[PDB]
Structure formats: C-alpha cells, structure tokens
Write a protein that binds this DNA or RNA. Structure first.
Ligand code: ZN
Length: 235
DNA sequence: CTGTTGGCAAGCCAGGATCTGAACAATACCGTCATCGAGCACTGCACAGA
C-alpha cells in the first residue's frame, strides 16, 4: 500500500454481519452540517458529497469552505473553535470526502496540504454554478410535471458535475495570472468563459429532448431562468 | 486591289377592398453497489466389484 518496509504485515481479516440502531444524531466535531427546520424541531444532517463533489485543482479547500460559509450549512466544531480563538486569523481547510453509490465509490475529492482574490474567484465560480442549477432544476421539475420519464428529471445533477470538470480547465491559467493589477481583468475574462460554459452545458443537458413539442414551455422557462441569473452575475 | 461619315433616342399619370388560418391521442423497459450462508447444480476421482 505504501511501499515501505515493515516487520509485521497483515494479509487478511475476518468480518460478519452486525446491525444495531443509533437514534438521534451524535455531535461529531469533525464535519460540517446542514440545518433544516421541519415542523417546530431543528434537524441537522452532516454534509456529504451527494450528487456532486465540488472541486477545483489547487483550491478545492476554498470551494468547499465557501459552500459551507454561504450556501443552512454550518462549520465543523473544530473550525468553530478556531474562529473563536483567532477571529482575525486566516483560515484554510484540510478536507475530504467520497461520492458513492452504496458500496461503490464513484468519486474522491481531498485537499491535504500543509488569497482574497482566490476567495473572489471561488465566489464567482459558485455563482455561475448556481445559475446553471436553478435553470436545469426548473427544466427537470417541468419535465417531471409533464409526466415525462427518463433521465430528464436529473439533468441538473449531471450538468453540475460537468460544470466543475469543464471549469477546472480554466483554473490553472487563472491562478497563474493573478496579481494586484491583473486581478480584475482575469476575473472578468473568467466570467465571460463561465457564462459561455453555462450556456453550452445547458444546451448539452437539454439536447436529448429536442423535438419534444410538449416540453417547449418547460424548456423556454428554463432558458429564461438561466439568462435571468446570468445577467445578475455581471457586475 | 479597294467597304464611309454626322446627327438624333420623349413626356404625363395611375397599383384596391372584403374575410377566413383546426382538432384528438400517444413519449417504454433492463443491467452495468455489496454482503452472508444456505440450498442445490457441473465435474472430475479414482476405484471394487460387476
Ligand atoms: Zn504501508
């Protein structure tokens, strides 16, 4: 596994089925959580990479940090402590998680290494991500309400995954050219790029349902939603 | 063998209205996680004794 020499090396183990039930939610201090209020009670759910694993090369920790900071998400208890001990000190994460289909691991995202522009870049990135999601969720819902079947009800999931992968290609050049005087220019260029990408991904996600006349109002509403949110992103 | 030149080519005025443009029914399903032990199959294994 590691390639190092070792006196003792294990080669197998034994396991057996074993079940129980933990009622309630144990206050684990190492994970951020989502706060939801159902009925009058407060519900918490620990964060997990569900249908996407938000990540960019070099700055994945910043992407995850901002999602917790902005999108009912709450920071981990160990992070909450550090903020209270040093409120003015800059805070970066060491983070990781898996995307899974039951026993199968589909995706791994980990940032393990031991600035405001980067925050701005990530903030901009997430904005276009959100614009795309709202547009395609609008399509997916309309697709569902129109009694249509198939993968049309989750096109917002695939397109979100494709968003991060297609935009990751832009990141190295962006990071390489960032400095005091060039920051506003490279971020503006990033916006145009991400604007174009969102349009492409929208069209790509929706392409298999061309010539479905009953879906034209759903498609039209979805694209109008996209451009509404894209316009709100240009400063 | 030898075949030409000048001068000249128009203007007026006029192009429409009525009224009409559809409806129904139908858009799929499967598989591409895993676990455990059991109940029940190919499948060769020599043989012992036929
Ligand atoms: Zn090792």
């Amino acid at each position: 596994c590691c390639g190092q020499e070792s006196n003792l090396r294990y080669t197998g183990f034994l396991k057996e089925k074993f079940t129980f039930t933990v009622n309630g939610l144990w206050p684990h201090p190492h994970s951020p959580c989502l706060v939801t209020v159902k009925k009058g009670e407060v519900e918490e759910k620990f964060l997990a990479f569900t249908t996407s694993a938000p990540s960019w090369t070099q700055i994945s920790r910043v992407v995850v940090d901002k999602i917790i900071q902005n999108e009912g998400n709450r920071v981990a208890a160990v992070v909450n402590q550090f903020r209270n001990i040093a409120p003015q000190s800059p805070l970066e994460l060491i983070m990781g998680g898996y995307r899974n289909n039951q026993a199968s691991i589909l995706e791994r995202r980990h940032d393990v290494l031991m600035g405001n522009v980067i925050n701005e870049i990530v903030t901009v990135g997430l904005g276009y991500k959100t614009a795309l999601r709202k547009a395609l969720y609008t399509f997916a819902e309309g697709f569902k309400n129109k009694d249509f079947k198939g993968a049309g009800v989750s096109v917002h999931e695939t397109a979100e995954r494709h968003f991060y992968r297609q935009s990751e290609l832009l990141i190295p050049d962006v990071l390489a050219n960032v400095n005091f005087s060039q920051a506003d220019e490279v971020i503006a260029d990033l916006r145009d790029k991400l604007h174009q990408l969102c349009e492409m991904l929208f069209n790509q996600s929706v392409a298999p349902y061309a010539h479905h006349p009953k879906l034209i109002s759903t498609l039209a509403l979805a694209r109008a939603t996209l451009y509404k949110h894209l316009r709100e992103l240009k400063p």
